[PDB]
């Protein structure tokens, strides 16, 4: 129950990392397209794990990472709902996006 | 079929799907029988099923999901279970065909009475 959220946040962290690199000065030295393609590949390989755990448990998951505000009985927070739909759509989208990037 | 039989041919006898018990339930059965369930509320709850999912055909499905989880990576190991589950749903759809036909024949009877 810790590997799951770990992966679900790691995929977003991977996709972030290049964007961050964009800010920096390495691009003029580095092959940004291959960098991003491979980061996406590893994001997909990560996203796969949720599929195995989900088909083996069929346990949906719901998370509230960060609490943004508290607006007088109507709060807000970065909430994820890793259920069948999204946990599968991530993998499909990455399987496509890796090829598209190449 | 019944569609045109209703729309361009005879216009009333063709029954209505949404009022089936409109006729008494034992107009031709001397002490008609009733149905049976082979899985209890507690089981069909703890197994976390859905409402368009849990019918009188639920035990086959429970055994199916057990055999599917167990040996998960060796999937395709639950096929004699799917066959039986589809068999039960076929049986149910046949029961419904038969109830519709029953109402059709009973309307035929009523109209024969006039």
């Amino acid at each position: 129950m810790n590997i799951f959220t770990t992966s679900i946040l790691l995929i977003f962290i991977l996709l972030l990392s290049p964007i961050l690199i964009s800010m920096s000065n390495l691009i003029k030295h580095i092959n940004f397209p291959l960098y991003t393609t491979t980061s996406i590949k590893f994001s997909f390989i990560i996203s796969l794990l949720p599929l195995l755990m989900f088909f083996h448990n069929n346990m949906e998951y719901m998370i509230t990472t960060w609490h943004w505000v508290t607006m007088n009985s109507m709060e807000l927070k970065m909430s994820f709902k890793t259920d069948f739909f999204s946990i599968l759509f991530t993998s499909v989208a990455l399987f496509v996006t890796w090829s598209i990037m190449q | 079929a019944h569609l045109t039989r209703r729309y361009l041919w005879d216009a009333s006898v063709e029954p209505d799907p949404e009022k089936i018990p409109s006729f008494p339930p034992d107009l031709g059965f001397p002490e008609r029988k009733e149905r049976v369930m082979v899985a209890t509320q507690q089981e069909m709850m703890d197994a976390q099923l859905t409402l368009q999912q849990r019918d009188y055909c639920a035990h086959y499905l429970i055994r199916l999901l057990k055999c599917k989880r167990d040996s998960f990576p060796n999937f395709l190991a639950c096929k004699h279970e799917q066959h039986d589950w589809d068999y039960c749903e076929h049986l149910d759809y046949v029961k419904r065909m038969k109830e519709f036909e029953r109402e059709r024949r009973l309307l035929q009877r009523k109209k024969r009475r006039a």
Binding site: L88, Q102 | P17, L61, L64, K68, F75, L76, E89
Partner: protein, 151 residues
């Protein structure tokens, strides 16, 4: 399309993959299109669906094959109506590997998922053949008609 042709001979790889995709979209029985499209075409006629809606839906299921074979003919079976010069190149890996991976996916993942996901809903497996095989029959019809017209 009006300025291309002979794509099969001049470029077999993309044409093979394009045919794969075209037939999958038509609804070929086991190419990851079937495993959703044909259950959908079951339910569409099996439930209390509005007549005109059902009808235009099946017409569209045919027009799928229609314009797919349109692509096929106008791009892959007629003559090379494109300019004389040629600098073809597809032996590059960054363009030959992705399509390969995507074809393997488009052939396997549909089946894999249809057999691995929890069975959300209760299907309906009791109907006549002329309602269980409607999509198949009508797509074959589209193939024949497109051939006749393109010729």
């Amino acid at each position: 399309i009006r300025k291309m042709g002979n794509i099969t001979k001049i470029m077999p790889f993309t044409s093979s993959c394009l045919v794969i995709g075209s037939l999958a979209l038509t609804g070929m029985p086991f190419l990851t299109g079937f495993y959703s499209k044909d259950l959908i075409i079951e339910a569409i006629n099996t439930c209390n669906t509005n007549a005109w809606a059902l009808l235009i839906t099946l017409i569209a299921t045919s027009m799928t094959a229609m314009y797919s074979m349109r692509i096929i003919y106008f791009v892959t079976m007629t003559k090379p109506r494109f300019p004389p010069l040629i600098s073809i190149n597809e032996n590059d890996p960054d363009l030959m590997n992705p399509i390969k991976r995507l074809a393997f996916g488009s052939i396997f993942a549909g089946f894999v998922i249809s057999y691995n996901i929890p069975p959300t809903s209760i299907p309906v497996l009791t109907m006549p053949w002329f309602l269980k095989t409607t999509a198949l029959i009508i797509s074959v019809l589209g193939f024949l008609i497109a051939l006749e017209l393109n010729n």
